[PDB]
Structures are given as structure tokens and as C-alpha cells.
Design a protein around this ligand. Structure first.
Ligand SMILES: CCCCCCCCCCCC(=O)SCCNC(=O)CCNC(=O)[C@H](O)C(C)(C)COP(=O)(O)O
Ligand code: SF4
Ligand code: SF4
Lengths: 140, 385, 112, 10, 185, 83, 165, 27
């Protein structure tokens, strides 16, 4: 309930208001992704997760609850993701890479050679449900 | 502003350090490190050696943490070979990697404190360094450059009394660390010469490629032994110390805690080490016993083929990184299917840390530049291969 | 500052060659002072040396190769401007300098 | 190895 | 988070005209792209929410003398947030200038200087592209396959000249190359 | 402002040091690259020699404009720095 | 803050109470047994696996064990070994030249573990510093002298690691 | 052989690894 004393990260400072700096960045992201063509994989994912996070930031007033339900970093690590997605949208718009070439071809190699168990392997835990919901949205 | 040169040729600071500093007054404005004086062409020499013949090059990369580089090279070769390692060999490798981590931290802390002006802890720490290098001399025949960790299993087995002697060492290393801390931690001069010098934000550490203590001092809880565990590190209990201010003092408290936790891991490895064989049973990749080569024909053929041609790694390429004492040590090994590596880049943490000296020292006192260099724990064997 | 983008035609390559030559010529006074070349070489013999290098590398018609040559020459010039190279090195590179050739080579060794 | 090649596919 | 998820996500979200080769294996998920889309791909992969790759581990070159585009430049990337590694590769010959990524990753400067020193690949918009490892005035790029192991020049002290001088190399014992290759491979 | 006398001599003197320039042809009006059959390298070398016999500088946008020694000597005579 | 805490931490600031605690620690080590050894008289502990000066061994009958298989010259990562061989008058496969560059040697022990007849071994000797570069170019005679001079210790060590190698 | 280096039966004795406090001084 109380304001966050420290974020635990050097350079990252606690933002006194995080439900008002995120509800605005998400609104800007949703109002600026419109320039991307509708049938592009980027727009669908960036307009799916930005809608869910925007709804979550609208439902619950306290930052602790927002941290709990999203479960992906602190509210001070979500502002720095929204501000980077906003920059990425502009860079996509000015570059305009949306044109699929007529002579496009991609070699999708699929190797299956196993690796040992003691070998260092990056094994993360299950991602939040949205990372899969956006995925089914993209495939569909 | 004038253009000043620190070349310390004397190993009171590294030995091949060459900084060209632009000082306005007493503050330094830009620190350009001139590297290349210890560039011995190691990366090109690897391509002319057999996979077994190129193992000793990794001892001489980070000559303060020897087993750390061999572990990474062996793991890369195993990954490209799909070679399974027995549990006892894995426990031995973890044990001698955590001994190596303690050795590196003990050298780093006191060679950094000697730069400040504290001469007493240096000899005290080198006493325990000699005690630990005695164990290096027991399993192998070399005090420093021990070709002990090898791609298949481990080179050879442990002597009879090694476990007892290591336990006896661990019974007093805690008090040794306590004395070393009590000489430096509470001292006001040590605090005044380290606190708020070298502050790095987490974003800066991520952008500049910082790893290990340099990264974990900024609040980033990123340990490669817990994020991408290797060997039996996921069966051992140890904490990951994380800093709060990012200055040189946090890098020192974390460098203490990482060595206490290394002692803890060593104790667990001693207690849980099982019995069995120390090498993979695929003698197509591992040497036969000296009693089997002199008695069996196929064992002698395997010995002859392994000690001239060696094994052949299937054509592939991968990047394997381990948690070296300095930070993330990675090997990018490329194989074309022959008995010699096609390409082997060595990703040294010191290369990414000495590169960031420019922004860490900017607008700092001239005497505060040696503390910034010593807190990164740089050795130039790895900086310029 | 940054490495310039790769050229698209021979005219841009020629412009870059001229710019590099002018920069090298303006760098001549600095070398005569950093290294004791005052009572060693005329201020025009070196200029002729750079001109000779540009002229004997003047048969290239590939703009990329010309740009790479210019970049290497600029790197060499920057190294010489600094005290990086030894004194005799530039004096060993940047100074302008009978029976039969076959018979002398024969008298020298079998490996021509 | 499953080295199938993607195409525009209209 | 994982090789199975990153591959499928980047298949959909990424623009198709950038990547032309996508291997998904246990040795590493690689992306092979043209040299004129490298900066765009690495900027996308540094800012996107689900592909927050904020660490450039290293930049290495690989020499393939048998290929038309001789050099292969590999970008090993790391994502601390999602605990995943991505590798991006391009190809360039000896006279092409590929784009520099120091704007995105400040640590790319020394690795790009090392790549230029070792292989001769030049980077566009690099603040300072000079040799970082080889000796001053070094001629040739040692990490090329056609560069001799011992080099072309050797260093000795010349007493009459009163300085350390460079001379053509002359080995007292030449490097003995042992051919252990087997015909039954 | 400088008189034409000495500025004419200072440009009629240095041009004869190119081991190919004919002394009989150099005059207040004798184009560098056209009338003397010079190379573009010599076309910039004459300008650089103009700043090699003095300390003033010629911007890169003032070198390729007019390769005529008449306008060159007029510009030299309109150099307040020289004397 | 609290008056008591402020006063207590102010006393420590002015009375140097955290430097006396280090002076006492140093003084305690002052009156303490030393850990230095008289190197000329007493030597530091070693191990039977120590990789020191190289030695060429011979059979107890007096025949040299080296069979000119060149299996140590091909495993040497530093290319410090050069071997020349031919058929001896008896018809046995022996070496005419066996010289090791100790200025190239990295003392890794690969040659010792690759020899199928236990001919080349790294003995316990580590005190062989020379005054000349050519005295470090060991040849067959020098190596055989080393093997003859250190034969008993080498044999005992090889017995020790027979259980492990 | 079957006699291999390892911990004795029952394991090794427990060893401290944390900082030991030192309350020395009258203050
Ligand atoms: C102390 C100073 C240190 C640095 C000194 C310099 C060291 C490197 C020297 C330069 C090395 C090179 O090859 S870099 C320069 C190499 N590039 C070329 O030669 C372009 C091809 N030449 C042509 O196009 C024409 O012949 C042209 C000559 C331009 C004029 O003739 P026109 O206009 O009529 O056409
Ligand atoms: S110890 Fe190693 S480097 Fe020395 S001769 Fe034997 S194999 Fe070669
Ligand atoms: S010393 Fe041993 S390995 Fe070397 S040639 Fe002689 S028998 Fe073979």
C-alpha cells in the first residue's frame, strides 16, 4: 500500500505514480500502432499485450496488485518497456519494412542433434499467460 | 587539457597497463586503454592444434582462474560431441572450479588493496593462495597451469588424502576471510577510497556488456550458475549476492560474499561426492588405461589414434558460456568435421570491462582511477588474446 | 568521425582521394616537428612521395577498393601523426629512391 | 536435416 | 523464453524481408540476414517487449575462403529478462562495408575494431575504426585463412641502429605441419 | 591589397618545379590542367603549393572551382595575409 | 536520530575505534610463528605427479626404452620435440636424435602420458636454470643422463601412480 | 581400484562460513 522505498536496481528510480504513467504510454502505443498495416504480425502482438496491460492498469488502483497479476517485473520495469515500444513503433513506421518481396525465400533449417545434460542450457520458467495468448493470436 | 600517460611496466598495477589520460585539472576526462601488448595470437594458434592440443591455451588466458577456462572449453567440446560426463567427474570439476573462484577472488581483493596502500592483507591472502595451489599441485603436476579438466571426463583421479586436506582447509578459511574483512571492511579510509567511486547503473552495465560482479553490483541478479546451470550446480545450495549502489565498495562486499558461498559449495561438493569412474566410457573420445593399452589390441589402437590425431568433432558451431570468477567466459567454437577446430573465439569478460573504463572514470580524481581499474579485476591474458 | 558510407561511383572515389591527399599534405608540418625532420627532408619530397603512391595505385577502377585504400592510407597517416611508429620507420618508407639482370640473379642464387 | 525452403506463396 | 517459443514468435512478428535463414536447434537459434538489414533487425530485437535483448555478448568473424562472400560476421546476443540467447549472422567480402551497431550497443566498439583488425571488415558510422590488437604499423589481417601463422616480419634489436627493428621473418626451426587426417572419415 | 608585380612573380616561380612544366609557356594566363596538360593531382598540387609558400588555407570548396592561373594570381593579389 | 546513538557513533569517529581494532589484529600476528622456509636447506612440499625436468629412461638391462614411435612428438602442443630414427645394427627401432626444446616446452606432461613404453618422463627436478640458451636445448645424451641420475625417484613415482595411470 | 578417494563414512564435520562477530572494546 505504501510507496515503494527502493527498486533494488541502480539507475532505476521509483516512480511515485505508476498507474498514471503506464495508462498513458499504453494509450499512446494503441493510438500509434494504427499506422502499421492490419495484417502484420507486429501490429497484432503489440496491440494484444498493450491492451491487456492497459486493462490491468485500469482495473486495480495499487501498484502491488498490478505487479502481482502481470507478474513480469516491477512497475518501473514496465514503464521502460512501454517507452521502448513507443520508440520501436516510430522506427518501424519510418523504415516501413512491411513490404513482402515477390522473390522472398527463407531456408528454415531444423536440426535435432541432442546435447548433453551437464552442458549449460538456458532453462527459464513458464512465461505469463499473455506471452502465449499473443502467440495464438499471431498464428490465428 | 594535457595528455598524460600511465604505463606501469612494474606489476604493482597489472604490468602491461597502458592508459592515455586526458586530465583537465586533477580530474580525468577520457581514459583510452591501449591494449595489444599481450596479444600472442592465441585464437589463430588454436586453428593449428588438435582439440586436445589446444586445451593448455585456455590455462594461460585467465592465469588467475585456470580451471574456469578449461571447464568452458570442455563443456563446448562436450556440447559439440554429445559426450556424457560421469557424476564423480562433474563433482570434481565443480569442486576445482569453486577452488579456482576462491583463488581468483583472493588474488583480486588483495592486489586491489595493495594498490590503495594496504600491504598486510596481500601476504595473508597469498598464504591461503599457496595452501590452495598445493591442492592444484596434488591432482595435477603443475601449481598453476593444470590441464586437469578435459573434454571427456577429467584427466586423472584424486590422491588419497586430498579430501581430508581440503576439509581441513575449509575448517579455517572462514576465519581467514573474517580477518581479511576485519582489516578492510570497517576501516574508514577503505570506505572513503571506495564508496561512490565507480558507480554504474544497471542499464549501463547491460549496454556495455558487463557480467559477474561488475553486473551484479548494480542490482542485476544474473548468475550463470543459476540462469543456465551446468554440471551439478543445480544440486547445490548457494546464495547470489546482489549490490545496491553500484560503487566500488559493493563490488568488494559481493566479492567477499561470492567467496564465502564458494566455501559453502566446496563443503557441499566434498560431502556429496559419489564414487565411480572419472571419464566417459566412450574410449573413441577418452584415453584408455595404461594397463589396458599394454594388454589389449583395440585399446592400443585407440591410444595411438587419440594421441596423434585425436577425436573429430562433427561439423557444427555453438557458443557456451560459464560463470568464470571475472564474469561470463564464453567460447565460440566452430567445427568443420576435422580433428582441428575451424574457429574458436574466446569471449573474455575483461575485454568488456576494460572497455567501460572510459565512462566509469570520467570526472574522477587521478588517484581514484587505480581503484576503478582494480575493482574490475582485469588480467591482460584474456583482454588481448 | 565515423567511417563514411561506401561510395557508389568513381567520381566520389576521386573526390575522396583528393580530400585524403589534401589532409595528408596539411599533415606534413606536424610530422616535421613531432619528428626531427627539419634538417632531414624538404617539405616537398614527402608530398611527392604521397603523390607517387597515389599514382602507382591509380590503375584501380573499383570504387570499393579505392575506398578501402583511402581508409588504409588514412589509418597510416593517423598512426604517423601520433608518436606510435618509430622515427626511422617513416624515413625508411617515405624517402624517394652492368652486365644483365638475369646474370646477376644467377650469380646470387638459384631461386629467382 | 529438415532444410525446407519458404516461399511467398501468393 | 525458450528456443521453441522465440523461434515461433520471431517467425510471426519479424518482417519477412529481413531474415533469410532460421535454424532452430539445441546448439543455438540463429538468424541469418542481409548486411543492409542487420541494424534494423538488432534495433527491433533490442526494443520489442517480448524479445528484450539488451546484451551484446560479442561480435566474431569466420573466414570461409571457398565462399563468394568470404567473411561471416556473428552477433551473439543475450536477453537477461527472458533468459535466452539469440545469434544473428551476416556475410561480407573483403571490400564491403557493413553497418555498425555501436549506436544500439555501446560495447560493440572494441569488438568491431577487433573484427576489422583480424579480418579487414569495415563498419559504417563507427566513431573510430583503428587496429586494437596488432602492433603499430601491422600490415595484413592475421585471422584470415591465407595469412601465414608466423606472419611476414620479425622483430630484433639492431645494435648499430640502436633501436628495435623489423626484419623479414626467418625461422630457425620451421613449423612442422602434421597431417593426421584419415581416409576412412 | 597587393600589387600585381610580386604576385605574378610568386606564381611564375613555383610552377617551374614540376619536372615537366615548360618555362616558356608559363605566363599570367596559363591554365593548369588544360593549357599545360597537367593531371588533377597536379591541379590540386598547385593549390597546395600556394598554401605551401604561405600559411593561409584554401577550403575544399575553393580548390576545384577555377584551374586558371590568371584568376589564381588575382585571388593571390586579393589575399590580405600575404605581402 | 537518537541522542545515545549519535553520541556513540560520534565517539567512534573521534576516538578512531575502528583503527585500534586493526592495529590489535596486526600486533597479534606480530607475535606469531612465521611461515617462511629456508629454501637452500628445506624445500617446499611436492607431489609424485610433479612435472619437472624431462628424463629418458632405460630398461634395467641397460637398453633404452625409447622405440622411436614418435607418439610424443605428435602430441606435443608446443612442437618442442624433434626425433630422428633409423634401423639400428641389430635391426631394432631406435632413435639417433632425440632433442627437446626446453625454451618451447610448456611442461604439460602430454609426452609422458602418450609414451607407450614409459620412456620419456618428467622427473621431480625443477632446479636446472642455466646461464646459456644452448644449454636448454637438451639432446639425447643429456636426457639419458637425467634419466640415469633420477632413476630411483622416477621409478618410485611411477610405482606410486601405477594405481592411477 | 575399489578404494577410492571420498568422504569418510558419516560425512565430514560441519564448518562455519558466515562472519563471526567481534565485540571488543569498552566504548
Ligand atoms: C606521412 C603521411 C602518411 C600517409 C601517406 C599516404 C599513405 C597512403 C598513400 C595512399 C595509398 C593509396 O593508394 S589511396 C589512393 C588510391 N586511389 C586511386 O588511385 C584512384 C584511382 N586513380 C584515379 O582515378 C586517377 O588516376 C587519379 C589518380 C585520381 C587522378 O587522375 P584523374 O583525376 O585525371 O582521373
Ligand atoms: S611436456 Fe608438453 S610441451 Fe613439454 S615436451 Fe612434453 S608434450 Fe611437449
Ligand atoms: S619417448 Fe616414448 S613416445 Fe616418444 S618416441 Fe620414444 S617411445 Fe615414442
Amino acid at each position: 500500500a505504501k510507496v515503494k522505498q527502493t527498486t533494488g536496481i541502480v539507475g532505476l528510480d521509483v516512480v511515485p505514480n505508476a498507474r498514471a504513467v503506464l495508462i498513458d504510454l499504453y494509450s499512446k502505443t494503441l493510438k500509434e500502432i494504427q499506422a502499421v498495416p492490419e495484417d502484420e504480425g507486429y501490429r497484432k502482438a503489440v496491440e494484444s499485450f498493450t491492451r491487456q496491460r492497459l486493462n490491468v492498469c485500469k482495473e486495480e488502483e495499487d501498484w502491488e496488485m498490478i505487479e502481482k497479476r502481470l507478474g513480469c517485473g516491477q512497475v518501473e520495469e514496465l514503464i521502460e518497456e512501454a517507452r521502448d515500444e513507443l520508440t520501436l513503433i516510430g522506427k518501424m513506421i519510418e523504415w516501413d519494412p512491411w513490404g513482402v518481396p515477390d522473390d522472398y525465400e527463407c531456408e528454415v533449417i531444423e536440426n535435432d542433434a541432442p546435447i548433453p545434460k551437464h552442458v549449460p542450457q538456458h532453462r527459464p520458467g513458464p512465461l505469463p499467460e499473455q506471452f502465449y495468448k499473443t502467440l495464438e493470436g499471431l498464428i490465428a | 587539457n594535457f595528455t598524460l600517460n600511465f604505463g606501469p611496466q612494474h606489476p604493482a598495477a597489472h604490468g602491461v597497463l597502458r592508459l592515455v589520460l586526458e586530465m583537465n585539472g586533477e580530474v580525468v576526462e577520457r581514459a583510452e586503454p591501449h591494449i595489444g601488448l599481450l596479444h600472442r595470437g592465441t585464437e589463430k594458434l588454436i586453428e593449428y592444434k588438435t582439440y586436445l592440443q589446444a586445451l593448455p591455451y585456455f590455462d594461460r588466458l585467465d592465469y588467475v582462474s585456470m580451471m574456469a577456462q578449461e571447464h568452458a572449453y570442455s563443456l563446448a567440446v562436450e556440447k559439440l560431441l554429445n559426450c556424457e560426463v560421469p557424476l564423480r567427474a562433474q563433482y570434481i570439476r565443480v569442486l576445482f572450479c569453486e577452488i579456482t573462484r576462491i583463488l581468483n577472488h583472493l588474488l583480486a581483493l588483495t592486489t586491489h588493496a595493495m594498490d590503495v596502500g594496504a600491504l598486510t592483507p596481500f601476504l595473508w591472502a597469498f598464504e591461503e593462495r599457496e595452501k590452495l595451489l598445493e591442492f592444484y599441485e596434488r591432482v595435477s603436476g603443475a601449481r598453476m597451469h593444470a590441464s586437469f579438466i578435459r573434454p571427456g571426463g577429467v584427466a586423472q583421479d584424486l590422491p588419497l588424502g586430498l579430501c581430508r586436506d581440503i576439509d581441513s582447509f575449509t575448517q579455517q578459511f572462514a576465519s581467514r576471510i573474517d580477518e581479511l574483512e576485519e582489516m578492510l571492511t570497517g576501516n574508514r579510509i577503505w570506505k572513503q577510497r571506495l564508496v561512490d567511486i565507480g558507480t554504474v547503473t544497471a542499464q549501463q552495465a547491460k549496454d556495455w556488456g558487463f557480467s559477474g560482479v561488475m553486473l551484479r553490483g548494480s542490482g542485476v541478479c544474473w548468475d550463470l550458475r543459476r540462469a543456465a546451470p551446468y554440471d551439478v550446480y543445480d544440486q547445490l545450495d548457494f546464495d547470489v549476492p546482489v549490490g545496491t549502489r553500484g560503487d566500488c565498495y559493493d563490488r568488494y562486499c559481493i566479492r567477499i560474499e561470492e567467496m564465502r558461498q564458494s566455501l559453502r559449495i566446496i563443503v557441499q561438493c566434498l560431502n556429496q561426492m559419489p564414487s565411480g569412474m572419472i571419464k566417459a566410457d566412450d574410449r573413441k573420445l577418452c584415453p584408455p588405461s595404461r594397463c589396458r593399452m599394454k594388454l589389449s589390441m583395440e585399446s592400443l589402437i585407440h591410444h595411438f589414434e587419440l594421441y596423434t590425431e585425436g577425436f573429430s568433432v562433427p561439423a557444427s558451431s555453438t557458443y557456451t558460456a560459464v560463470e568464470a570468477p571475472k564474469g561470463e567466459f564464453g567460447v565460440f567454437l566452430v567445427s568443420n568435421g576435422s580433428n582441428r577446430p575451424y574457429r574458436c573465439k574466446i569471449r573474455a569478460p575483461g575485454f568488456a570491462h576494460s572497455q567501460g573504463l572510459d565512462f566509469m572514470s570520467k570526472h574522477h580524481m587521478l588517484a581514484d582511477v587505480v581503484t576503478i581499474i582494480g575493482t574490475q579485476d582485469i588480467v591482460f591474458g584474456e583482454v588481448d588474446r | 568521425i565515423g567511417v563514411p558510407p561506401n561510395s557508389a561511383n568513381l567520381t566520389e572515389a576521386r573526390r575522396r582521394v583528393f580530400d585524403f591527399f589534401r589532409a595528408a599534405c596539411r599533415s606534413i608540418p606536424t610530422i616535421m616537428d613531432i619528428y626531427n625532420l627539419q634538417d632531414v627532408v624538404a617539405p616537398s619530397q614527402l608530398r611527392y612521395a604521397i603523390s607517387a603512391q597515389i599514382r602507382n595505385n591509380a590503375h584501380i577502377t573499383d570504387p570499393k577498393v579505392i575506398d578501402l585504400l583511402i581508409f588504409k592510407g588514412m589509418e597510416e597517416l593517423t598512426d604517423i601523426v601520433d608518436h606510435a611508429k618509430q622515427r626511422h620507420h617513416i624515413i625508411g618508407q617515405y624517402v624517394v629512391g652492368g652486365k644483365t639482370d638475369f646474370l646477376k640473379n644467377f650469380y646470387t642464387s638459384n631461386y629467382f | 536435416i529438415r532444410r525446407y525452403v519458404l516461399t511467398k506463396d501468393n | 523464453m525458450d528456443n521453441q517459443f522465440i523461434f515461433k514468435y520471431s517467425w510471426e512478428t519479424l518482417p519477412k524481408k529481413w531474415v533469410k535463414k532460421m535454424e532452430r536447434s539445441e546448439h543455438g537459434n540463429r538468424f541469418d540476414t542481409n548486411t543492409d538489414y542487420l541494424f534494423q533487425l538488432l534495433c527491433f530485437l533490442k526494443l520489442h517487449t517480448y524479445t528484450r535483448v539488451q546484451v551484446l555478448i560479442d561480435i566474431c568473424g569466420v573466414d570461409y575462403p571457398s565462399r563468394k562472400r568470404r567473411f561471416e560476421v556473428v552477433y551473439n546476443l543475450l536477453s537477461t529478462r527472458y533468459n535466452s540467447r539469440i545469434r544473428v549472422q551476416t556475410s561480407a567480402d573483403e571490400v564491403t562495408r557493413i553497418s555498425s551497431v555501436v549506436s544500439l550497443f555501446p560495447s560493440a566498439g572494441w569488438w568491431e575494431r577487433e573484427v576489422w583488425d583480424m579480418f579487414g571488415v569495415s563498419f559504417i558510422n563507427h566513431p573510430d575504426l583503428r587496429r586494437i590488437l596488432t602492433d603499430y604499423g601491422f600490415e595484413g589481417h592475421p585471422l584470415r585463412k591465407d595469412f601465414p601463422l608466423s606472419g611476414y616480419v620479425q622483430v630484433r634489436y639492431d645494435d648499430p641502429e640502436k633501436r628495435v627493428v623489423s626484419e623479414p621473418i626467418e625461422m630457425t626451426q620451421e613449423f612442422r605441419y602434421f597431417d593426421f587426417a584419415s581416409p576412412w572419415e | 591589397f597587393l600589387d600585381k608585380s610580386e604576385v605574378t612573380d610568386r606564381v611564375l616561380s613555383v610552377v617551374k618545379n614540376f619536372q615537366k612544366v615548360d618555362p616558356s609557356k608559363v605566363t599570367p594566363k596559363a591554365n593548369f590542367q588544360n593549357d599545360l596538360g597537367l593531371d588533377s593531382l597536379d591541379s590540386v598540387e598547385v593549390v597546395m603549393a600556394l598554401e605551401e609558400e604561405f600559411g593561409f588555407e584554401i577550403p575544399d570548396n575553393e580548390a576545384d572551382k577555377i584551374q586558371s592561373i590568371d584568376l589564381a594570381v588575382d585571388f593571390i593579389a586579393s589575399h590580405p595575409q600575404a605581402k | 536520530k537518537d541522542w545515545n546513538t549519535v553520541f556513540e557513533r560520534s565517539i567512534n569517529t573521534l576516538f578512531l575505534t575502528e583503527m585500534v581494532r586493526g592495529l590489535s589484529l596486526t600486533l597479534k600476528y606480530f607475535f606469531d610463528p612465521k611461515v617462511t622456509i629456508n629454501y637452500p636447506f628445506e624445500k617446499g612440499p611436492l607431489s609424485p605427479r610433479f612435472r619437472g625436468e624431462h628424463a629418458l629412461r632405460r630398461y634395467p638391462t641397460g637398453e633404452e626404452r625409447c622405440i622411436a614411435c614418435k607418439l610424443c612428438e605428435a602430441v606435443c602442443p608446443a612442437q618442442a620435440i624433434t626425433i630422428e630414427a633409423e634401423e639400428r645394427e641389430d635391426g631394432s627401432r631406435r632413435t639417433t636424435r632425440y632433442d627437446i626444446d626446453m625454451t618451447k616446452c610448456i611442461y604439460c606432461g602430454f609426452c609422458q602420458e602418450a609414451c607407450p613404453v614409459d620412456a620419456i618422463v618428467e622427473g621431480p627436478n625443477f632446479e636446472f636454470a642455466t646461464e646459456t640458451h644452448e644449454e636448454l636445448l637438451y639432446d639425447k645424451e643429456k636426457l639419458l643422463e637425467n634419466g640415469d641420475r633420477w632413476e630411483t625417484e622416477i621409478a618410485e613415482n611411477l610405482r606410486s601412480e601405477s594405481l592411477y595411470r | 581400484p575399489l578404494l577410492q578417494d571420498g568422504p569418510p563414512p558419516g560425512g565430514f564435520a560441519p564448518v562455519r562460513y558466515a562472519r563471526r562477530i567481534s565485540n571488543t572494546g569498552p566504548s
